[PDB]
Design goal:
Layout lengths: L1 E5 L6 E6 L4 E5 L2 H28 L3 H4 L4 H9 L6 H6 L5 H21 L6 H6 L8 H6 L9 H14 L3 H8 L21 H12 L6 H4 L2 E5 L10 E5 L2 E2 L7 E7 L2 E7 L8 E3 L3 E7 L5 E9 L2 E7 L2 E4 L1 E7 L8 E7 L5 E5 L4 E7 L21 H8 L7 E7 L4 E6 L14 E2 L18 E2 L5 E4 L24 H11 L6 H8 L5 H10 L6 H6 L3 H11 L10 H12 L1 H9 L2 H7 L4 H9 L7 H22 L9 H4 L1 E4 L9 H7 L1 E5 L10 E3 L6 E4 L3 E5 L7 E3 L17 H5 L4 E2 L4 H7 E9 L1
Parallel strand pairs: 1-30, 3-7, 11-20
Antiparallel strand pairs: 2-3, 2-30, 4-5, 4-22, 5-27, 6-26, 7-8, 8-9, 9-10, 10-18, 11-12, 11-17, 12-13, 14-15, 16-17, 18-19, 19-21, 23-24, 25-26, 27-28, 28-29
Helix pairs in contact: 1-5, 3-10, 8-9, 15-21, 17-22, 18-22, 19-20, 19-22
The structure holds calcium ion and chloride ion (CL).
Length: 762
């Protein structure tokens, strides 16, 4: 039992950490609960939360040196700079006191690491610096880690239209699925060749990428099921968000108890509160809903004054801010400037062509600190209060599923939603006033559902705006995720008239790939005719065909056909289809293109290429995939299974700049894993070596109303301290598709407690 002084804490508080590393906080005041959460989040994740803050405020170079200056400048270009009075009120009514209590608890732990250097996280010693003190405003001013779009897609679409000319619409059709499948129209007044992709992406990456430590510088699914369809008779609510994997993990599980507060679940460890989980009356989980929140604005600048741009027939001056960037090893801070138009920060300027480009990012406006709208539903007790809280949900765009212990279930999407009167938001626009956001939509303009006749709701990042609903015409967004996971889960959930918690856990682990099944179906139609017939004479081609013939499209870790297919579908087939459908230079820009759109061509190639050419492309690329699989196997006769290639290594940010012995302790190797980006058990990978990069780390399946029966997992662990056994103890549970209890009642928490922490006001 540890006992710590707690300056700023109002009343004594206790923390019971259970055997799986989940902290259970018991405070005597509402706001004391958030003090303890900040203290406990620092205890487990101080380096991580300090790193997020350092990156967000543009303070990296202060300790990491001159290579980080450009990233610090761009980070400050995308901090919230609006009115703070409005900002605090955007999230609910007491967000400022919550944030103030939280950072006081963080700062208490920081002070403790100065008093007791054995408590300082290893990474600080590894890099030669110390944790910083926090201010409440830091919590809401940092924005750039929020999931968002579509600045990058606008640049890519414009670049393709500039390069592909008359083939642009066909090439863009293969590059990116739109839903609904509208025809993009170049905005009047846009020259798509006046969009320098490399410079813009570089500036955008410097402004938004997570903290990175390169060698050079150092040399989702959710668903809710009504009780009439569950084995318990109570609702079941499940959620597994799909995000970057790493050690430590993106999210952290915790439990807050105080007078007026009883919430348990997950969130990013630097944010106060809980955004996925339940409060003993309602439960909630989320998946991305893609309202378009970024537009690239293109300006003409005055030749006599490059800091002025044309706006409504007048030269309008940019606002220029000066920032001081402290650099390790330099006595004076660097003085840098950042220019802003009336629409946002200038990412790039070209005085040769008298042009500038600014990011018009809705996430720089009030209320867009990611997930912090949960302030207003952590204490909601019914649907009216949950729907009300979602009225002010800012970022990221999300589908919320809802259930309560009275048996109700529901769905409401939310997020700051831009009105574009005269463009679709799919291309950059002239910034001279012809294209202006008309305001934001009220959330009651979006569809929603409450106790639907079906008795179940599934969302999985697909466009779920009903085509006959008025919102289908409002330009909410046209760029959604591949819909395979949604279709697969919708099939499974509708096909089970009675299902249990065990069944929902299994669905989160489902590895059937609808792209695989559809590709297999196309293969059965390949004609033994034209050049394809000769290719079927290749022993290597016939070897691959044999593997696929006896496969059901289940992307299992122990499956050799699955390995062949994932190699083929990611690195061979689609690039070959695109190259056979487009001129060479548009094909190079499109690459593997959009899986859904390429699948459509494979199934109906008529207007793209002769069916015989389709067949030839499939078998030629399949041969190359088989060659690669053999190349990657122990021998060409003992072939690698998918799991042999698809390694689940949770990588630490410093892995590439430390030695082998140190890397082995920072990284967490969980072995081989099944699945792909397109299976409900999402295990997206990088194409170089098929290693895991993204998917569900935190997973949750709740018995809504019998709370102690809830199940969760996280990975690789609850602790961010490599010397703590909770750093890596959850990864095997996750690797087996298993869970541990989400204990909630006082008796269950006591039964599960392994350590007690006592905080005393001082
Ligand atoms: Ca846009
Ligand atoms: Cl557009």
């Amino acid at each position: 039992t540890d006992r710590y002084a707690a300056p700023g804490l109002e009343k004594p508080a206790s923390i019971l950490i259970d055997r799986w590393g989940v902290p259970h906080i018991y405070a005597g005041t509402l706001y004391d609960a958030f003090y303890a959460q900040g203290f406990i989040a620092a205890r487990d994740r101080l380096w991580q939360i300090d790193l997020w803050r350092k990156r967000g405020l543009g303070e990296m170079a202060r300790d990491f040196g001159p290579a980080y200056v450009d990233g610090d400048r761009m980070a400050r270009a995308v901090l919230y700079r609006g009115d703070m009075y409005r900002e605090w009120l955007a999230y609910g009514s007491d967000a400022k006191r919550v944030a103030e209590a939280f950072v006081a608890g963080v700062n208490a732990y920081v002070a403790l690491t100065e008093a007791q250097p054995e408590l300082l996280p290893r990474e600080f010693k590894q890099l030669g610096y110390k944790p910083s003190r926090w201010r409440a405003e830091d919590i809401v001013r940092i924005r750039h880690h929020g999931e968002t779009l579509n600045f990058t897609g606008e640049v890519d679409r414009a670049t393709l239209y500039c390069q592909a000319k008359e083939q642009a619409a066909r090439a863009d059709w293969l590059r990116r699925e739109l839903d609904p499948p509208i025809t993009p129209t170049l905005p009047e007044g846009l020259d798509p060749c006046a969009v320098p992709a490399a410079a813009l992406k570089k500036a955008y990456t410097l402004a938004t990428a997570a903290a990175n430590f390169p060698k050079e510088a150092w040399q989702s699914n959710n668903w809710v099921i009504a009780g009439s369809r569950t084995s318990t008779g109570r609702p079941i609510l499940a959620n597994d968000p799909h995000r970057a994997h790493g050690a430590p993990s993106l999210r952290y599980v915790s439990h807050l108890n105080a007078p007026g507060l009883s919430v348990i679940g997950a969130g990013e460890p630097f944010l106060p509160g809980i955004s996925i989980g339940h409060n003993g009356t309602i439960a909630f989980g989320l998946t991305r809903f893609y309202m378009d929140q970024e537009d690239l604005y293109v300006y003409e600048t005055d030749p006599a004054q490059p800091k002025s741009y044309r706006y409504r027939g007048r030269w309008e001056p940019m606002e220029t801010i000066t920032e001081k960037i402290t650099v390790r090893g330099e006595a004076e801070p660097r003085t840098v400037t950042i220019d802003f138009t009336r629409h946002g920060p200038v990412l790039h300027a070209d005085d040769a062509s008298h042009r500038a480009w600014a990011l018009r990012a809705a996430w720089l406006d009030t209320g867009m600190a990611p997930y912090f709208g949960s302030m207003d539903y952590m204490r909601a007790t019914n649907w009216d209060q949950f729907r009300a809280a979602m009225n002010r949900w800012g970022a990221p765009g999300e589908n919320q599923v809802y259930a309560d212990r009275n048996g109700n279930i529901g769905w409401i999407p939310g997020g700051l939603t831009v009105i574009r009167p005269n463009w679709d938001g799919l291309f950059p626009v002239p910034g001279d006033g012809r294209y202006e956001w008309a305001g934001y939509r009220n959330m009651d303009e979006l569809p929603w559902a409450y106790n639907p006749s079906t008795g179940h709701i599934v969302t999985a990042n697909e466009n779920n705006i009903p085509p006959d609903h008025p919102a289908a015409k409002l330009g909410v967004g046209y760029e959604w995720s591949d819909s395979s996971r949604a279709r697969r889960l919708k099939s499974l959930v509708a096909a089970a008239p009675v299902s249990s918690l065990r069944d929902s856990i299994a669905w989160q682990n489902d590895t059937v790939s609808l792209p695989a099944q559809r590709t297999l179906a196309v293969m059965r139609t390949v004609g033994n005719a034209g050049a394809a017939a000769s290719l079927l004479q290749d022993p290597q081609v016939q070897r691959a065909v044999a593997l696929l013939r006896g496969w059901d499209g289940n992307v299992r870790a122990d499956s050799v056909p699955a390995a062949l297919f994932e190699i083929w579908f990611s690195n061979h087939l689609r690039q070959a289809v695109v190259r056979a459908a487009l001129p060479e230079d548009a094909a190079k820009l499109v690459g593997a293109g959009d899986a859904a759109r390429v699948l459509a061509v494979l199934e109906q190639p008529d207007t793209w290429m002769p069916t015989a050419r389709r067949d030839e492309v499939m078998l030629t690329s399949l041969k190359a995939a088989m060659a690669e699989l053999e190349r990657r196997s122990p021998s060409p006769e003992k072939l690698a299974t998918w799991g042999t290639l698809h390694r689940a290594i949770f990588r630490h940010p410093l892995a590439n700049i430390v030695d082998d012995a140190t890397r082995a302790q920072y990284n967490v190797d969980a072995g081989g894993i099944g699945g792909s980006a397109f299976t409900p058990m999402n295990t997206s990978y990088r194409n170089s070596d098929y290693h895991l990069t993204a998917g569900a780390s935190f997973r949750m399946v709740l018995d809504v109303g019998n709370w102690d029966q809830g199940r969760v997992v996280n990975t690789p662990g609850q602790s961010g301290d490599p010397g703590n056994s909770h750093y890596r103890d959850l990864a095997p549970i996750w690797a087996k598709g298993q869970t541990f209890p989400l204990v909630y009642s006082r008796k269950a928490v006591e039964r599960a407690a392994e350590k007690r922490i006592e905080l005393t006001p001082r």
